[PDB]
Design a protein around this ligand. Structure first.
Ligand SMILES: [Fe+3]
Ligand SMILES: [Fe+3]
Length: 689
């Protein structure tokens, strides 16, 4: 079928020859047929793929980044595994190898001859330029990195550069005629082994490659001895010392496919079969990870142990990692364009309504705070990881997911409290909020023991009050992991839209975006889920004490709420009792930990300082609060923060997400998550690999 086979993109004749040799041994094994597409440059394949002319190609990390940028939107589906069968690695090292006997060090490359694997490649270009930036004397306001580099080295061979604009950089290249500097193996000194040969042939003084390049080209140690590495501290060392003498560690190459309609599973079915039949140390007629004499790294890096399947949620940015992603980014942006990015705090807004409140806050703040937006909290978390956003306030259940991804609590949302009216809000200890089950008095006979079969309203899936606590307790008493099988129907924003957990959700004013986990969905959040109950859409709602009081007896003023009486409602206790909504202290399901602001540990220090100041202006008793703008007031819609919040308190020290949530709650969620797999959670385990 037009999708029952994978078309592989090749950028050279031998690669094409290898591909056909691969396609041949494949059918004999009966697997998704392999079609081979011919091309002449890496770009051509990237473009070819996104244009549905091909489905797969293995790319270097720096090309993987470039492939994920909007025009193409490609994504890593499988990572090459290196190292050894007992000690595998999914990363490698960028080293600078030089002929033993020379004298120059890292800080003396000026005027030398250079050998690069290719332009935009991890080891051959990205890492070095990063390290060598201080000595380059480059001004983006005058010319591009290439210009600076062309004025640094006297001559080199950086395949792919423009021999017309920057001849200086294609001199040492050995390509024949038009092939000179070609961005493909059509150029001898192209790739890892090419740049190495560029050095071996004494054309250049340095070769920027990876740790294994030497051991792959020179087997007899006697030969190796003639070569050394350049260490960061400006000293040389033997090539087997790369673990100590390296410029940087980078992520392995990856196979990339289309983001949408990419044949992922098909590509992976083939690779997993291919590696199991013709992998390392495996059958020796045809080697998947080997190229004929004089040929190298055809299709896949030579001597790779195999592949690793990449989870659906990790895209190019995530796959590369914060460290590498930052480095690459610093290469494409201005020096101040980056300083600006660091001086400001980028808030992540979830939905159109929160986005609007944020754009407002941004204006009032003076542009110190800026905004980024996502349709879901999970997406905002990913944005913070990629460095697109700095922070946001998360419910306890989300702090577990953000925690499982390395984000940390910074300040906690402090609701005005009766107790401890002794201290000031910013240093006042946090007192959780009570999660409760509310029902309508009229709903006779409905107690905790009779929730089975009823209809339910939940703030959203994965949140404390509306999900973790209720479903946690229901799972323990039910034994089963089937929650969508407990209630006949419900509204739990975030669940499968085609599921019955979304069968009672509204969507926006036009019935659109039904079940979407953001304020656009009528029955989302504390207030949304309460309204779901009030309107008789569900038999029970799972919210917190505060919600009942804030939207009854005319405290909301919103149509559905203005005429609601708190005496019309009751709370379901765990002892099978119903109680007036004034009996919360004795009739709650659990006391949850306050919502809090998270961020990357390396950014936390900054975010906090900016926040404590912001809140001094638009917080409860801020300079311009009533009059110009109030941070914790969103007209009962709880946008960005809860409306009943007085301030954001210091967490006293630097608790981890586990410390903040409490052991009790953490395991509770943990055991419940054992019933379901969360894409972001999977993607995150992989982030630590
Ligand atoms: Fe590489
Ligand atoms: Fe909550």
């Amino acid at each position: 079928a037009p999708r029952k086979n994978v078309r592989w993109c090749t950028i050279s004749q031998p690669e094409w020859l290898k591909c056909h040799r691969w396609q041949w041994r494949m059918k004999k094994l009966g697997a998704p047929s392999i079609t081979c597409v011919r091309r002449a440059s890496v770009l051509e394949c990237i473009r070819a793929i996104t244009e549905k002319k091909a489905d797969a190609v293995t790319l270097d990390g720096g090309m993987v980044f470039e492939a994920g940028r909007d025009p193409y939107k490609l994504r890593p589906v499988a990572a090459e595994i290196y190292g050894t069968k007992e000690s595998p690695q999914t990363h490698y090292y960028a080293v600078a190898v030089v002929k033993k006997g020379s004298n120059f060090q890292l800080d003396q490359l000026q005027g030398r001859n250079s050998c690069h694997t290719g332009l935009g490649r991890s080891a051959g270009w990205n890492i070095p330029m990063g390290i060598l930036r201080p000595y380059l004397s480059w001004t983006e306001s005058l010319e591009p990195l290439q210009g600076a580099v062309a004025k640094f080295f006297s001559a080199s061979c950086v395949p792919c550069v423009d021999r017309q604009a920057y001849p200086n950089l294609c001199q040492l290249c050995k390509g024949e005629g038009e092939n000179q500097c070609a961005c493909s193996p059509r150029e001898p000194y192209f790739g890892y082994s090419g740049a190495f040969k560029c050095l071996q042939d004494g054309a250049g003084d340095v070769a920027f490659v990876k740790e294994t390049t030497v051991f792959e080209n020179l087997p007899e140690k006697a030969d190796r001895d003639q070569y050394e590495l350049l260490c960061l501290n400006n000293t040389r060392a033997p090539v087997d010392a790369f673990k100590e003498c390296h410029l940087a560690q980078v992520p392995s190459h990856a196979v990339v496919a289309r983001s949408v309609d990419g044949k992922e599973d098909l590509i992976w079915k083939l690779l997993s079969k291919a590696q199991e039949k013709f992998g390392k140390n495996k059958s020796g007629s045809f080697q998947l990870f080997g190229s004929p004499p004089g040929q190298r790294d055809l299709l896949f890096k030579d001597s790779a142990l195999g592949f690793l399947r990449i989870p659906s949620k990790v895209d190019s940015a995530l796959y590369l990692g914060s460290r590498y992603l930052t480095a690459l980014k610093n290469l494409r942006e201005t020096a101040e364009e980056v300083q600006a990015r660091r001086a400001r705090v980028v808030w992540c807004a979830v939905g159109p309504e929160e986005q609007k409140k944020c754009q407002q806050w941004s204006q009032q703040s003076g542009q110190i705070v800026t905004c980024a937006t996502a349709s879901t909290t999970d997406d905002c978390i990913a944005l913070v990881l990629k460095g697109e956003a700095d922070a946001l306030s998360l419910d306890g259940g989300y702090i577990y997911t953000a925690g499982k991804c390395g984000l940390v609590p910074v300040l906690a949302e402090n609701r005005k409290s009766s107790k401890h009216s002794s201290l000031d809000c910013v240093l006042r200890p946090t007192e959780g909020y009570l999660a409760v089950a509310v029902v309508k008095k009229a709903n006779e006979g409905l107690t905790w023991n009779s929730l089975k079969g009823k209809k339910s309203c939940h703030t959203a899936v994965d949140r404390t009050a509306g999900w973790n606590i209720p479903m946690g307790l229901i799972a323990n008493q039910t034994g089963s992991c089937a929650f969508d099988e407990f209630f006949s129907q419900s509204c739990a924003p975030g669940a499968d839209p085609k599921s019955r957990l979304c069968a009672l959700c509204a969507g926006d004013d036009q019935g659109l975006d039904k079940c979407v986990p953001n304020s656009k969905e009528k029955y989302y959040g504390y207030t949304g889920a309460f309204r779901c109950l009030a309107e008789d859409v569900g038999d029970v709602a799972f919210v917190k004490n505060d919600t009942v009081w804030e939207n009854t007896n005319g405290e909301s003023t919103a149509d559905w709420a203005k005429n609601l009486n708190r005496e019309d409602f009751r709370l379901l206790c765990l002892d099978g009792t119903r109680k007036p909504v004034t009996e919360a202290q004795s009739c709650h399901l659990a006391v949850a930990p306050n919502h809090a602001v998270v961020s990357l540990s390396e950014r936390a220090a900054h975010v906090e300082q900016v926040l404590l100041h912001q809140q001094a202006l638009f917080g409860e008793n801020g300079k311009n609060c009533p009059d110009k703008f109030c941070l914790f007031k969103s007209e009962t819609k709880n946008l960005l923060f809860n409306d009943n919040t007085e301030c954001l308190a210091k967490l006293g020290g630097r608790p981890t997400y586990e410390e903040y949530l409490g052991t009790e709650y953490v395991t509770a969620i943990a055991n419940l998550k054992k019933c379901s797999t969360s894409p972001l959670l999977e993607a995150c385990a992989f982030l630590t690999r």
